[PDB]
Design a protein around this nucleic acid. Structure first.
Ligand SMILES: [Mg+2]
Ligand SMILES: [Mg+2]
Ligand SMILES: [Mg+2]
Ligand SMILES: [Mg+2]
Ligand SMILES: [Mg+2]
Ligand SMILES: [Mg+2]
Lengths: 150, 150
DNA sequence: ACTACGTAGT
DNA sequence: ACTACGTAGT
């Protein structure tokens, strides 16, 4: 697994299945929206995220993206509960301090497009109608990359 | 979807994922063990089955295979119930009379191998320890095809 | 064992 | 809506 640009993967490239992102090293998980690793000194850091309408996120053609954390049963669900600051959610949070590039794959209505590298600027806790905590991650697209239309 | 041999697919060919069987027209479903269609006169007929240890089936190097029907919660399960003679289970049963070739894909411990064409000779009802009905399909490998080792 | 922004078909 | 002999990762 790598952090940042993946060789042979261009901004704007389109993919049919999630497993292609696995083979090409873009996004290893099969379902999980967030992928991560441990760096020099076992601290979780995000490497790639996928926003395909599975949660609350609505994507516009801006440079700033709001990404919802995983868990708490929101989307394909089961009774609601608090989200946890572990694994992918934790990794995205640590990526704020480490200032590492995070790949972003957007789902299109074949089905996936690589939109380039982003930086996790911050995060916070929201309390939806459930009565439970959800995480929101504010990511900004690193300037210089090719633009993509929608 | 086709009945019988698929062009470019040889007996002994190996595949990594189920979706390859979908693309090459070997086995369209993503999880379901049985694939089927309606022929001239809307009667369900099986086209391909997959035996990858998901149920009770144990495969030897014989020409006769015993295939368990789907449903009734057996394998990845949820309370037990009777299996139903619908869809794939029904299609395999009708394939007995229609005497049509049925493709067989065996799972290996990359992960899938095409073992050739089979004929559904018969079927019957078993009553497991659940107290519920399960279907058993007796298939025989059509003579003449290349042999495969295990 | 459990999770998980999957995936096709009916 | 529901099903389903999936699939990777922890
Ligand atoms: Mg909001
Ligand atoms: Mg028996
Ligand atoms: Mg669908
Ligand atoms: Mg149906
Ligand atoms: Mg596994
Ligand atoms: Mg874990």
């Amino acid at each position: 697994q790598i952090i940042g640009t993946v060789p042979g993967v261009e901004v704007g490239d389109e993919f049919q299945y999630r497993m292609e992102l696995n083979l090409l090293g873009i996004h290893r998980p099969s379902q999980s929206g967030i992928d991560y690793m441990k760096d020099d000194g076992g601290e979780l850091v995000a490497t790639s995220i996928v926003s395909s309408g599975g949660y609350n996120d609505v994507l516009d053609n801006s440079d700033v993206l709001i990404y919802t954390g995983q868990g708490g049963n929101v989307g394909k669900k089961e009774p609601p509960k608090d989200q946890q600051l572990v694994t992918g959610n934790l990794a995205l949070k640590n990526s704020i301090n480490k200032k590492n590039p995070v790949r972003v794959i957007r789902g299109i209505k074949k089905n996936y497009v690589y939109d380039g590298l982003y930086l996790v600027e911050e995060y916070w806790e929201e309390t939806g109608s459930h009565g439970k905590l959800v995480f929101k991650f504010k990511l900004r697209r690193i300037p210089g990359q090719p633009e993509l239309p929608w």
